[PDB]
Amino acid sequence: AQKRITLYMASASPFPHRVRLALEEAHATYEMIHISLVDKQDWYQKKVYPDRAQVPYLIYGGPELHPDEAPSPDAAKIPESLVILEFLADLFPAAHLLPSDPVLRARARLFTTAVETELLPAQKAFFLMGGPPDAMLAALDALQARLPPAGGFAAGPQWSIADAAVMPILLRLRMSVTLEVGFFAPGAAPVVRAALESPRFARLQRYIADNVARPSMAATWDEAAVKAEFVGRFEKLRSL
Amino acid sequence: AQKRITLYMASASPFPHRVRLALEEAHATYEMIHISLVDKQDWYQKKVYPDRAQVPYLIYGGPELHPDEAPSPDAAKIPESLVILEFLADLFPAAHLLPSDPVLRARARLFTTAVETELLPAQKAFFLMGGPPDAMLAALDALQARLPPAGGFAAGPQWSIADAAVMPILLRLRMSVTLEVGFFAPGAAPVVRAALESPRFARLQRYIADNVARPSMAATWDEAAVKAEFVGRFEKLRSL
Ligand SMILES: O=C1C[C@H](c2ccc(O)cc2)Oc2cc(O)cc(O)c21
Ligand SMILES: O=C1C[C@H](c2ccc(O)cc2)Oc2cc(O)cc(O)c21
């Protein structure tokens, strides 16, 4: 049997979306609970996750959870979207959320490492610090060249959690420069938008379409819900 | 030869030591090529690892490999010490470099996540940027508190690649503040050194001792060679 999975989450961040993708790809059974910035004050820092009150957060095991309850002592609390991706691959081995070959598992984890050390820093300096679009586009060149040039997904022919880790990021990057919502340099957003639609990113376009076609994306991507919450998160930042 | 392991390594840096600990714990057959961290052989970048020319770098498969040779095209090349650790737990499932339970595996990964996002940057601010010693001790307090208080290793009663990830940092940090070899603020190295010997850090002294008592330390930790290359690296960097 499958012990109980309750995911604490939100829509603006790419990070809960990563977890949902894997959960869907494993045809897992789970419930979701949403979490606001007022939830993290009133009850989610006091009652559920005191250390850092971050989502995403998996509760594995124990009984049915509703909002404002504390997780049972005996259930496991698992933060950190990448660890959770690894946990799901361990929990659902029949789903091959990671390939079986040790070298191709490394290749998946090297892909993710680079999303984290290279793609995310570039996005931050570009969308949040007004950096120039050259830097952003060169990070995207590099990401694209790490894709298998002979086609398929990040680690090769089979979908893996390396795809779950980057795809939420690319979708929101595209949205944020399509809506021009960000702390961009002047005209930076439409430079990046037009380049992502051009031949320089053919391989990446194809990779995005290959991921968006799988039933797991339709099941985890709600344009409006993400947009709504993405715009909001930008205004929070903006204020302060 | 379908299983040959060649490791590009060095002594001063913690990251190749992580891999050696794992190889010894797995009773793996392997060969080492020594890349100098004081005067890096430029054939390493030109013929072996052009992108980043960093150690550790693990060559899996193919024929015998000598210094000043390119690895075979048909062999796998794996950088990133934490990826290599996971790679070796997958190569050697019977060694149990990770526990079998998914929650305990997540526990190990979480522990490592914390070494990476809290301990290393604290060490960096401290050893490289001359930051105050109490900030460094605070990251050490937190590390110690994440250990099982009764005894045992990072993730439980069994050794795991999470001990392989943190033990080389701990050893070199001790050595570094004991010889005051670093860009420390006046009097900050002795504060940390004396606090590491005091009853505040007794649980952590235990952890280091328990790890050092395992055969894998004697087989991987040559303190005189580490110190020679660590001092030589530091003096070179200072002169610049
Ligand atoms: O999921 C991660 C991310 C974590 C990490 C997080 C932040 C950081 O700066 C570095 C590493 O390292 C790991 C180490 C592992 O053995 C397995 C893992 O799944 C991870
Ligand atoms: O070893 C790592 C570290 C890498 C990482 C590097 C920098 C960073 O900020 C976060 C993660 O992420 C991972 C993700 C995985 O699924 C498995 C892994 O072994 C790793």
Numbering used by the authors:
A (entry chain B), B (entry chain A): 3 to 242
Task: Paste lines from the article.
In this study, we demonstrated at the biochemical and structural level that T. versicolor GSTs that belong to the Omega class interact with polyphenolic compounds found in wood, and in particular with flavonoids such as dihydrowogonin and naringenin. The ability of TvGSTOs to bind polyphenols through different sites suggests that fungal GSTs could be involved in the transport of various polyphenols.
In order to determine the structure of a complex between TvGSTO6S and a flavonoid, several candidate molecules were chosen for soaking experiments. Each naringenin aromatic ring stacks with its symmetrical equivalent in an energetically-favored association (−13.64 kcal/mol calculated by DFT). In TvGSTO6S, the naringenin pair fits the apolar environment formed by the neighboring aliphatic part of the side chains of both monomers (L84, V85, R111, T115, E118 and T119) while a hydrogen bond with E88 stabilizes one of the flavonoid hydroxyl groups. For the first time in GSTs, one structure revealed a symmetrical ligandin site (L-site) filled with a pair of interacting ligands.
